[PDB]
Amino acid sequence: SGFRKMAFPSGKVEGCMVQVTCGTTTLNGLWLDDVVYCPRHVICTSEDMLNPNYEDLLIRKSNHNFLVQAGNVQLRVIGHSMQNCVLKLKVDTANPKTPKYKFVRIQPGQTFSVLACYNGSPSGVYQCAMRPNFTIKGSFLNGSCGSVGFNIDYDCVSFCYMHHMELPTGVHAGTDLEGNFYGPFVDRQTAQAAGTDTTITVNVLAWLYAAVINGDRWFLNRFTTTLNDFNLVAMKYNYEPLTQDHVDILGPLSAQTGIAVLDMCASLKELLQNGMNGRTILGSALLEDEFTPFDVVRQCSGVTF
Amino acid sequence: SGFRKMAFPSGKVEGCMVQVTCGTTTLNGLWLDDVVYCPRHVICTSEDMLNPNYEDLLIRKSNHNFLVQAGNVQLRVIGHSMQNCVLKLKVDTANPKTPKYKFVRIQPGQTFSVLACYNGSPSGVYQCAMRPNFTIKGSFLNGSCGSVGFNIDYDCVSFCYMHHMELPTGVHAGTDLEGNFYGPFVDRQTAQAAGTDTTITVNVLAWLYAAVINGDRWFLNRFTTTLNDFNLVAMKYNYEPLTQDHVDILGPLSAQTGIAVLDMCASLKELLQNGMNGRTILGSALLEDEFTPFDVVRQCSGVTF
Ligand SMILES: CC(C)C[C@H](NC(=O)[C@@H](NC(=O)OCc1ccccc1)C(C)C)C(=O)N[C@@H](C[C@@H]1CCNC1=O)C(=O)c1nc2ccccc2s1
Ligand SMILES: CC(C)C[C@H](NC(=O)[C@@H](NC(=O)OCc1ccccc1)C(C)C)C(=O)N[C@@H](C[C@@H]1CCNC1=O)C(=O)c1nc2ccccc2s1
């Protein structure tokens, strides 16, 4: 037992990280087969970033302008192209460490692991969620751009995020691996802000189920509720509406614990209206919404890769 | 910016994990050079665990009784010996993926990453601290024994923990890689419990420094305190006494933020006496004590490996 914030094993993604330098700028790239993916602003100076004309900047670059380093081995760039906000560098050597992989665009509420890298070297791994306002609550310093977010399903690494920028209040924004941003943001140093965020209701419920599985049960009340009455209450407290899709997704945890989803909704409703009275749930003093139902199941089932 | 609970990249340790089977029992082993380390109770049945006579059980085993699997490759055991609570299996093949490594015994208050494994396959990675009562707050199911805890300093993996057992209230106990338990526990299924735990004061202070580095500053008061007066207060609230060694260790964060350690102690003293008034620090509603000063520095400096 026990419940911890848990990342995927990062080794498969570690063997893919390289360092990309174009003139003054150095960030991280993702090396799969004979292609390296990195943020397109690798071609920017600091002055360039205020309002970059990316096409104009890229025509002034040759293949030899891009210094790609894997370990202490320089990779020769033999082609380059721009796809949305990402740069694709064909290299003359396929990565022998390439895992089975795919590129996916995740939905708000879903989680992934981030391998935070600097100068193409892995620094650490942490878990976060795509927030409803299409930001993530990351930990990123100068030089972290090109770090990626991923899930592992079986033996396949599903890359879903590449890091580009930091936004007001210290939250973060990035793209899928086709270069399309999550949210309405652009890769430009001009004032922009995320919309108001919301709590990921289905994840809170999954986390209450994890609490029950671990014997932390004090908040279970004796009542039930309809889906509609629950959503009227949750809306007041800035919680996402719970959908039937969400109810379905919670089915396995409901069956494991023998608590119907709408009963657990009744217990969350009392927690929102009354607070937790200085008490904790799984060692936390507020309600956690960055564990999906799949995260809870995987962790309370020992799913391996 | 941003501050997350962050694990070390786990790839170096992933390439060391194997599956050890002796008769009915299967758990995880650590393969370095031509030796596999695992918990000695791999030789126990369920009845055996109530009061195992480990020497008697081991004489009844040959090398061929131990099935060691790395991937889909069986490793031939050519020797075996018992060292305290750990079994050492010499195999005829050195692990080609062996990293530079060492075995260390960590102190209470220090942190490490856990690579949680089942059937020799990595499930996930998380960070935890050696508690002052020599337990860890882990996440471990049946079959997790032999999972290890580690730090990475430069390119060297410092193995410090191997998982053995779960204790009342869902906390965990294990050994260093020489088989000596942390704390007074034994690898036997008989009632035992950890002593009362304490808050790791130096880590709380490190975490308040991280908060300031990230712009979360509301709790900084205008006062100071002596080391002695601080410790009189902290003792009341079950906080470890702060030593001069601890003050020294906090030096870098003090210099980065320009807040003297004893001033930050004054601010923690007011937090302990008055509470946090429904407010949060780095998104947490209680004081966190599982980030060391080194963790804060490494994370707010981007140290890579
Ligand atoms: C071109 C932009 C995308 C670069 C990117 N800008 C922002 O993140 C700004 N954000 C921002 O302008 O938002 C809009 C805004 C809001 C309010 C006011 C003004 C502007 C932030 C630093 C202020 C940026 O520095 N990326 C970093 C990761 C960054 C570093 C710090 N924390 C993070 O995660 C990355 O590693 C990269 N380094 C370089 C260095 C040279 C060249 C390229 C890159 S790409
Ligand atoms: C021999 C002991 C060390 C085994 C070890 N016992 C305890 O952990 C008991 N603890 C305990 O008896 O404390 C003392 C106590 C306190 C109060 C009352 C009675 C007894 C717990 C399950 C109750 C144990 O099952 N290790 C697990 C990890 C475990 C599994 C669940 N969460 C965890 O972390 C491990 O993977 C292993 N599996 C097997 C399976 C077969 C053979 C060996 C092993 S080794």
DSSP string, B87-144: EEEEESS--TTPPSEEE--PPTT-EEEEEEEETTEEEEEEEEE--TTS-B-----TT-
- Tell me which amino acid residue B286 is: L
- The torsion angles phi and psi of A273, rounded to 5 degrees, stand at -80, -30
Nearest to B9 among A10, A119, A215 (CB): A10
The CA radius of gyration of chain B, in Å to the nearest whole number, is 22
Q: Which of B104, B209, B214, B210 is nearest to B162 (CA)?
A: B104
Contact between residue B137 and residue B171 where contact means Cβ atoms under 8 Å apart: yes
Interface test with chain B among A112, A123, A163, by most B beta carbons within 10 Å: A123
Contact between residue A82 and residue A58 where contact means Cβ atoms under 8 Å apart: yes
d(CA A207, CA A213): 10
CATH topology of domain A11-91: Thrombin, subunit H (2.40.10)
d(CA B178, CA B162): 10
Which three-class secondary structure state does DSSP give residue B239? strand
Distances (CA, A) of A214 to A304, B23, B129, B137: 20, 30, 20, 13
Q: Which of B138, B56, B140, B300 is nearest to B40 (CA)?
A: B56
CB contact under 8 A, B9 and A138: no
With a 6 Å cutoff on the Cβ, whether A144 touches ligand 1 is yes
Tokens of A46: 């600091």
Q: Domain B201-300 belongs to what architecture?
A: Orthogonal Bundle (1.10)
Residue linked to tokens 């580095």? B213
Q: Considering Cα of A305, then B5, then B10, then B14, what sign does the dihedral take? A: negative
CB-count burial class (<10 Å; 0-12, 13-18, 19+) for A17:
buried
Which residues does A119 contact at the CB level (< 8 Å), separation at least 6? A19, A26, A28, A143, B304
CA A246 to chain centre: 20
Final resolution, Å? 2.2
Residue linked to tokens 């059937």? B119
d(CA B247, CA B255): 12
Residue linked to tokens 């399903």? A153
d(CA A77, CA A59): 15
Residue count (chain A): 305
d(CA B277, CA B291): 23
Residue linked to tokens 């981007």? B302
Say if B285 is an interface residue toward chain A (CB within 8 Å): yes
Tokens of B294: 């080194």
Tokens of B75: 């490793």
d(CA B288, CA B278): 15
Tokens of B249: 């260790």
Q: Is A164 considered catalytic here?
A: no
Q: What is the largest CA-CA distance in chain B?
A: 69
d(CA A246, CA B56): 54
Contact between residue A153 and residue A102 where contact means Cβ atoms under 8 Å apart: no
With a 6 Å cutoff on the Cβ, whether B85 touches ligand 2 is no
d(CA B10, CA A9): 6
